[PDB]
Design an enzyme around this catalytic site. Structure first.
Site, PDB file in Angstrom:
ATOM      1  N   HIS A   1      -2.026   5.792  -5.201  1.00  0.00           N
ATOM      2  CA  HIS A   1      -1.442   7.078  -5.509  1.00  0.00           C
ATOM      3  C   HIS A   1      -2.178   7.719  -6.676  1.00  0.00           C
ATOM      4  O   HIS A   1      -3.034   7.094  -7.320  1.00  0.00           O
ATOM      5  CB  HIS A   1       0.047   6.913  -5.796  1.00  0.00           C
ATOM      6  CG  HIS A   1       0.791   6.313  -4.651  1.00  0.00           C
ATOM      7  ND1 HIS A   1       1.403   7.082  -3.685  1.00  0.00           N
ATOM      8  CD2 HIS A   1       0.996   5.021  -4.295  1.00  0.00           C
ATOM      9  CE1 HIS A   1       1.970   6.286  -2.793  1.00  0.00           C
ATOM     10  NE2 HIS A   1       1.730   5.030  -3.135  1.00  0.00           N
TER      11      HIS A   1
ATOM     12  N   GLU B   1       3.138   4.561  -6.841  1.00  0.00           N
ATOM     13  CA  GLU B   1       3.117   5.736  -7.693  1.00  0.00           C
ATOM     14  C   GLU B   1       3.996   5.522  -8.925  1.00  0.00           C
ATOM     15  O   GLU B   1       4.948   4.727  -8.922  1.00  0.00           O
ATOM     16  CB  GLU B   1       3.607   6.956  -6.897  1.00  0.00           C
ATOM     17  CG  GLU B   1       3.613   8.272  -7.642  1.00  0.00           C
ATOM     18  CD  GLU B   1       2.213   8.745  -8.004  1.00  0.00           C
ATOM     19  OE1 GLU B   1       1.624   8.215  -8.965  1.00  0.00           O
ATOM     20  OE2 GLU B   1       1.700   9.664  -7.339  1.00  0.00           O
TER      21      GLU B   1
ATOM     22  N   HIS C   1      -3.409   9.059  -1.022  1.00  0.00           N
ATOM     23  CA  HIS C   1      -3.078   9.597   0.287  1.00  0.00           C
ATOM     24  C   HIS C   1      -2.983  11.118   0.241  1.00  0.00           C
ATOM     25  O   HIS C   1      -2.909  11.734  -0.819  1.00  0.00           O
ATOM     26  CB  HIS C   1      -1.737   9.063   0.741  1.00  0.00           C
ATOM     27  CG  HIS C   1      -0.662   9.336  -0.256  1.00  0.00           C
ATOM     28  ND1 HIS C   1      -0.132  10.594  -0.445  1.00  0.00           N
ATOM     29  CD2 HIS C   1      -0.069   8.532  -1.168  1.00  0.00           C
ATOM     30  CE1 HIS C   1       0.772  10.543  -1.407  1.00  0.00           C
ATOM     31  NE2 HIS C   1       0.826   9.304  -1.862  1.00  0.00           N
TER      32      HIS C   1
ATOM     33  N   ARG D   1       3.664   6.003   2.887  1.00  0.00           N
ATOM     34  CA  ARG D   1       2.579   6.976   2.980  1.00  0.00           C
ATOM     35  C   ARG D   1       1.229   6.371   2.574  1.00  0.00           C
ATOM     36  O   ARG D   1       0.177   6.831   3.035  1.00  0.00           O
ATOM     37  CB  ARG D   1       2.884   8.199   2.116  1.00  0.00           C
ATOM     38  CG  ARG D   1       2.960   7.952   0.603  1.00  0.00           C
ATOM     39  CD  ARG D   1       3.683   9.127  -0.044  1.00  0.00           C
ATOM     40  NE  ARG D   1       3.774   9.155  -1.504  1.00  0.00           N
ATOM     41  CZ  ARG D   1       4.840   8.777  -2.206  1.00  0.00           C
ATOM     42  NH1 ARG D   1       5.893   8.269  -1.593  1.00  0.00           N
ATOM     43  NH2 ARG D   1       4.864   8.909  -3.535  1.00  0.00           N
TER      44      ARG D   1
END
Lengths: 253, 239
Positions: free
Chosen positions: A187, A88, A10, A61
């Site tokens: 991520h 992440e 992202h 996100r």
């Protein structure tokens, strides 16, 4: 047969502006992060991509990035599936700290090793962290395959691969074997871990892979689900090289 | 017992142009999005915590679920979409002006197409300006019934008959497991599930009016029949 899938990380939010380690803190995209998703979507529409399934982490996100891409495509109806296994990398006690300040207190080179090396584990996150309870009490981290107490408190890249690969094996890879066109909205480091596995990248070489934000990553696979060549970026070759240097420079004086 | 939340999206341009969207994938407008946004604010102010959402395959229903999940900070909750929650298929009426239809065929006939329970409108035909926008869309080439077998017009009763298997097979087993479920659907498709769950007759169902942007709570027992009439949550709205 041959297989083709898209992976991406992202775009930016507030703590990216502030150059802070974000990791498992559930920071929202900002206005330019949302635009980055839309640009990926437009690029993917220009190549006439037609997705059958989307996989995401449970950090918002990465989900919002996926929703934005689907809207640009007129494919809001395509199934979305989310798992903490795509989160992440957990950065332990480095969560919320400034990167360039770390590079001051410990050198550019201790910082590079913390960020990009395969094996070194960050200091664990402790109950005194301002975001400890916000992370570990969050209801999204119950519904799963691991008790809340056995969730990680920090992760090496190696730890990421070991909780990510079971998800690839059981959920993502069988859909690829099925012939479906797949999008992975993840991520920086959870994508590096997956790339390391699929491409057979050494413990030593994975250090040198930095992924640019909001840029589609095309991966081609063979009948045994290993990469045919290196991953490729979609979009302008210079602008992407400049974008990689940016992420690299966050850890430099 | 059991709690269920159903709701209905807000408006788009055609709902201002007094027209029939039906299976045409018309998008929300600004108030259509803010309505879903406000609706998400109201479920948050009520401390609602969902485990599973269900939608149709039309984006006005999916965006609505998405905006609500953002207001809730619950974007990670699984979403599941299915044409069986689609709006009613209005056949050849699709896209036509409502008033202009009233002058073509008459107040009383258009009224009966829109409010009855058992009347199928005229089928949409390949000459219709939107026939190909619907039956060529890939979202139906990948669904649980062949493309030719999908309906070309539907009575309100046909809506329930295509909805009920999805309710019986997919949704209700999760209501039974204790999950707090959200159903982001459409006026007609929400009318059919209420008729089934409350037991409404072919006569009362025809006058039941359901507002948009409003959480609709339904309380059930272990046979999943309503414990009372559906209730609206929040307050102070009219029309």
């Amino acid at each position: 047969s041959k297989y083709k899938l898209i992976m991406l990380r992202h775009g930016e939010g507030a703590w990216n502006k502030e150059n802070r380690f974000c990791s498992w803190v559930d920071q929202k995209l900002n206005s330019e992060g949302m635009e980055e998703a839309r640009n990926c979507g437009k690029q993917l529409k220009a190549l006439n991509f037609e997705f059958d399934l989307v996989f995401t982490s449970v950090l918002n996100r990465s989900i919002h990035t996926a929703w934005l891409i689907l809207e640009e495509l007129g494919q809001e109806w395509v199934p979305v599936e989310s798992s903490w296994r795509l989160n992440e990398r957990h950065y332990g006690a480095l969560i919320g700290l400034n990167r360039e300040q770390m590079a001051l207190n410990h050198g550019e080179e201790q910082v590079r090793l913390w960020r990009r090396s395969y094996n070194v584990t960050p200091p664990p996150i402790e109950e005194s962290h301002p975001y400890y309870q916000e992370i570990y009490n969050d209801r999204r981290y119950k519904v799963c395959d691991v008790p809340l107490d056995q969730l990680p408190r920090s992760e090496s890249l190696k730890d990421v691969l070991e909780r990510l690969l079971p998800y690839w094996n059981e959920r993502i890879a069988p859909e690829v074997l099925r012939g479906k066109t797949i999008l992975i909205s993840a991520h920086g480091n959870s994508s590096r871990a997956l790339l390391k596995h699929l491409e057979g990248i050494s413990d030593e070489d994975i250090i040198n892979i930095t992924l640019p934000t909001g840029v589609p990553i095309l991966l081609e696979l063979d009948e045994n689900l290993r990469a045919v060549g290196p991953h490729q970026f979609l979009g302008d070759q210079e602008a992407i090289q400049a974008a990689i240097k940016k992420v690299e420079d966050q850890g430099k004086v």
